[PDB]
Amino acid sequence: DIAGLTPCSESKAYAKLEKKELKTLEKRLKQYEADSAPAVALKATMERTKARFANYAKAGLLCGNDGLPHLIADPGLALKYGHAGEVFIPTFGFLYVAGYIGYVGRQYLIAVKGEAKPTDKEIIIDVPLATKLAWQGAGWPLAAVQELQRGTLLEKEENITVSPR
């Protein structure tokens, strides 16, 4: 398929891998009773193992000669062949959360700079203010862009200290 890979659902090595893991679990099972606590736990593990291998095949992943899933990172190849969920979609999932955390922290830091004693507002968190800013961060991408266009996102070069040069 892509880069010589093949769908895991059609991969011989992938299928053989599932048998090896289930065989290992089954070997430990036969040293216990039918419905003892250890036996139930082992059976639960085997169910998750079977579900995991079905899910990855159902997801249409690609397996190499190793018979293990490989991920596609190029946006063009991902959207071309329906691998957007491996790296492309999770890319924009992380950035939203990462920007959320960073934007919320920046809002709080600016908020307390106006207080009389900013340092004491950092070791001892102002929880009522932090919760207020935590919820308003859901719209950070909109607020972040508008700050950039209005020119209030960055400090002036003349207001930043620098070493002799």
Partner: protein, 40 residues
């Protein structure tokens, strides 16, 4: 009580609660959606 709630607002106490919450959420998600590898 005002001072006690002030103590709970100190950085080490907040971080413990926050990460205890954050870790619990991630642990619980993986308990009900085991083995997530692809968004799908």
């Amino acid at each position: 009580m005002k001072d006690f709630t002030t103590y709970l607002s100190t950085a080490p106490v907040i971080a413990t609660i926050w990460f205890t919450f954050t870790a619990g959420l991630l642990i619980e998600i993986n308990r009900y959606f085991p083995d997530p590898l692809v968004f799908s």
